[PDB]
């Protein structure tokens, strides 16, 4: 009989749902990824993988001694409950290895936190899910609590830090083992 009650229930439902989708569309995640080639070797064949999120730009094809990658990963547009998570990688012909760098800026800080890592892999490889799993679970990732340092092997080491924010910054310097960081 009282069909106006069903119309009012629809107006309440879409009036809630349009604002709920507008919330998930407006919560934002970023990672300003800076990686600095202090290494004395040329990096090439710039490769990426995204477990979540995207970027609007390319990596440099190559990086050379004293220059840096700057890259801007972000969350996918629209009402998605996913952060920005991924790998970037470069081949290093002068040592026969691939440098891979991982970051993980989640959506829910109830369950997760900002993590990052870097490693050298044998031969020419490009960033994929097996690099994400190995950099996130098998290796020890670093968390967003200031500056950390580790040997890469093959005469290199990395020094780096990440913000605890969801609009994060990541900075890494890939030095020779002889050098003092920053």
């Amino acid at each position: 009989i009282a069909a106006g009650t069903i119309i009012a229930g629809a107006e309440l439902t879409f009036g809630l749902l349009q604002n709920l989708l507008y919330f998930f569309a407006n919560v934002n995640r970023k990672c300003a990824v800076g990686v600095d080639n202090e290494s004395g070797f040329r990096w090439q064949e710039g490769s990426t993988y995204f477990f979540s999120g995207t970027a609007d730009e390319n990596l440099p094809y190559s990086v050379s001694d004293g220059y840096a990658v700057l890259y801007g990963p972000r969350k996918t547009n629209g009402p998605v409950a996913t952060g920005v998570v991924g790998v970037l990688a470069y081949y290093i012909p002068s040592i026969g290895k691939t440098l891979a760098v991982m970051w993980s800026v989640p959506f829910d800080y109830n369950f997760y936190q900002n993590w990052w890592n870097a490693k050298l892999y044998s031969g020419n490889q490009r960033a994929d899910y097996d690099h994400y799993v190995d950099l996130y679970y098998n290796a020890n990732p670093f968390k967003a609590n200031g500056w950390h340092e580790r040997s890469l092997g093959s005469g290199l080491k990395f020094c780096g830090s990440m913000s605890s924010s969801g609009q994060a910054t990541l900075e890494i310097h890939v030095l020779k083992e002889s050098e003092t960081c920053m």
Copy 2:
């Protein structure tokens, strides 16, 4: 009897539909297509095909050694569920062949992803659906996961990459076989 219930159902219907059409009108797709003539040959007769989308500008008629195409493909205006997908092509008189470059930035990332390709075709040809089908299905397109390289034949090769975003960037360098990319 209660005609106000039909008026309230119409207000609910158009109140939903005006916002649904406003959604499809505001989700946007782009491809910033850069193609760089490192080739040592003049390109001419700049031609295009669009399977979906448009651009507000012309290609250069010609490109010459060390200059680049910059072109801005985009989605068609209004409430359409179509991305930007197309071909650009140039004749190369010095080798008797047509360079064609393809990109595909879809609407639904549920079903599709960003793809691109480039190839040399025999004689003077202009971009059309047969170049789109051959660059997308018969040849192997490259996906949006960093830098890729392939020989074109006739002394040329291409090196290029594409963003995974729907507001994409595409960059290609069309080098001689003797050269090192970027």
Copy 3:
């Protein structure tokens, strides 16, 4: 009896109609018409015809060797379902002929597409409906799919292209038969 139902039907009707007229008022059509006098002859008596649309400016009275027309045709203001369609023309005293250039940027891309053309006509003539019909139906117009070239006769040729967008650009170079375009 229930006169409030007629008032609510009027509020629904004008609430729809004010938004429908606002839609047709906001969908826009343009043609940025550039025509370049590479011809070695002075053009004069700049004339126009509009089958649909207008412009807020005059043509140059005359154009001379190495200068260009730039002209901005547009859709008529308000809730009209018409594009921008027209002819511009110039007399060329040094050959005894009229150059006429046509463009057609439609409203409905369901039924129509962007077309353009150029031709030389005998004697001093000014742009009118007979030039529109002859440039659109009797001659072969060119479509918005990259660069096209044709001989005009009397020692001239044209080279030109048009955008597939509804906010189009048109570019034409009117060269001598001896020259290489752009």
Copy 4:
């Protein structure tokens, strides 16, 4: 009995009427009138008449060889269905005649179109309704379809054009009979 139906009919009526008056207040008409004194004689006693519309500025009192009038006629403010229509005039002591220039930018392009004219009148006269009627009905006005030229007599001629838009531009050059226009 049901007085709320009369209140709802009043809210509908003023809700329509406030938007109808806002429409007529926002449709705009202009004429950017440029008149260029290439004549070799000083013009003085700058006079105006408006059949419809106004301007917020004065004419120059005088114009001299190689300078120009620039004048900005416009529609009267508020919800009026009238365009901008008028005459400007100057006395020319060196020939004993008055130059008068007319323009007519209508409201309804359903019934009317953009017209303009210019003429020389005997003795010192100022712009009035008899100049409007003689320039619009008795003389042949020119329409908004590109550049037109006519002899004034007394060793002068005019060359000029007008836009077909309702936010029009009018340009006139008042040359000696010896000269080539623009």
Copy 5:
């Protein structure tokens, strides 16, 4: 009984009245009054009268050979149906007379039009209602239809014009009888 009908009649009444007062508050009248002392005599004791309207600034105390008054009369703020109407005056010690300048920019162009005047009065006098009545009714005011000229006596003359707009401009040059205006 049905007191909600009286509340709805009040909401309709104040909903109309707030918009009616907002209309009368937003219709604006101005006069940009420029008066230029080409006279060879110093003007002093700058005086004003307003029959309607105000200004936010002072006159210069004095004006001297080759300088000008610029003054910005305007309508009184808020929902008043009155224009800007007034007199400015200066004493001229070198001839023993007061220059007075009048303007009248009305509210209703249904009943009134833009008028202005200027005159010399005997001795040191300051602008008041008797100067307004004598400049508007007893003397012949000039209307807003281009440039007008008259002798003041005492070796002076004025040349001037006014806009027909309600946001008017008034320009007057107060020359010696020997000179040619502007």
Copy 6:
């Protein structure tokens, strides 16, 4: 019984009252008070009184030959029906007297108008209500109708004027008796 009629009467009452308080909060009064020390004596101990209104700034402590006070009195914030009315004063040690300057910019121009005055008082005194009453009622204030001049005594005179607007300007020059104003 029908308690919704009392709620609707409250919504009408606060819907009116919030707009009435917003009106009294937005009608504004100012006085840009400029006072110029052409006097050849130093002024010091800058003092103020406000009968209505305030300022956000201090007076200069002192003023010296050829410098000026600039001061910006204004209406008190919020829904108050009061203008800006007050006194500023300075001691002049070189003559043993206090200069006091008064202004009165009212709220209701139905009952009041812009008045101002200046006077010299014996000894070191600071601005207070007895200076306001003596400058406004016992002395002859000047009204907002152009430039006025009066002797102060002790070898000084003042020359000054005030705007008739509620956002007024006041300008005063405090000269020696030997000098000609502005």
Copy 7:
């Protein structure tokens, strides 16, 4: 029974209360406190107390001969009925005393007014409630009515003034007894 009357009473209540809290959040109080060290002694250990309000900045640690404190006290954010009231203090090692400066910009000008003071206290002390009570009640504070001057003792004096506005300015110069203020 009629539960919609309780919902309408809640909508009226929160519709009033959200606007009442927005009023108390938007009425603002400030004191731009400038204190100028004309004293010939270094000030150090810059200390503060707030009876009401806060600032977003630090005092200078120290001030030295010819430099000034500039400090911006303000009201606490949100719907609080409290002004800005406080003390700033500095130790002066060269005389063995603490300079303390007090200001009081209230919320309710119905009950209170702008007051300020300054004094020298024995030994190294920091601003607290006992300095506020002694500067406000036991000593004679100065009110916002122009420039005031007093001896501090120990060879110093202060000269200063405060605005009567709630967005106040306070200026104080701390001179030697030999000097003439500003």
Copy 8:
């Protein structure tokens, strides 16, 4: 029966709750932390801990004699009732100790106030909850009431101050024991 009362109770509930969450999302807390290395020793391995809040940036890896940390802690985004509270730390190789600096800008000033501290700890340590507890409860923190100074030991001391605002500033200078602060 009357289901519209439940819909109206839902509209009231979400209409309140959307504004309550918007309040907690818009109340903001910051700490602009400046720490100045006047110490004559290099600081390195910049480390952080957050008990509440985040930052969008990294610390410098290292700081050296005469340079400063500038760091911008802030509240976590969205409707959370938590301030910004944390520790930053650096290792100092030249003395074998870790400098740690703490700040605490709360949400509820009903229960808490702005506190800060600094201390030297033995060996290379990184900021964590045990440094927060020791700097906040076991050591004596300083409150937001002007400049404070303390010996660190190992030849160093700190001098610093903090704002009482919730958008706070913190400034610390880490001097040698020989020096005079700021």
